[PDB]
Amino acid sequence: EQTHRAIFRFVPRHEDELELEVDDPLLVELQAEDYWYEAYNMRTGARGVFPLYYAIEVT
Amino acid sequence: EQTHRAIFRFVPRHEDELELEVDDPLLVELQAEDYWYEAYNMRTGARGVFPLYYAIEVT
């Protein structure tokens, strides 16, 4: 189920990054490593990393 | 003359990235490209890109 939500537009520049649109639903299985999250984007079905401060926890 | 200030810690994972600490003063000369800024970090003297929402504009 959805763990996080994207809060800022993120356009990948690098080959391991996950594209985000504001309010995109995210599934984060693991703890952040060195201020990056690894996520499955539930709108786009893509997987990848994004910066720690671009998503919040959902309740 | 400083144009922006970092408000969140940004730990590079990629070779072209700029390391930010909270409060670093930044010189942004160029237009953002796909919501990344290119900057000179006035604390460290380092250059590179970081995601646009990690900094505020200073007047």
Author numbering:
A (entry chain BBB), B (entry chain AAA): 490 to 548
Excerpt from the paper describing this PDB structure:
Aromatic residues cluster in the core of folded proteins, where they stabilize the structure through multiple interactions.
The A541L mutation also triggers a staggered conformation of Y526 and a rearrangement of the 517–522 region; however, the stabilization mechanism of the aromatic ring is different. A looping out of the β-strand between residues 517 and 522 is observed, which allows the side chain of A521 to reorient and to stabilize the staggered conformation of the ring through CH–π interactions together with L541 and V517. Thus, all mutants—including A541L, which stabilizes Y526 in a staggered conformation by a different mechanism—share the same initial structural trajectory and report on identical breathing motions.
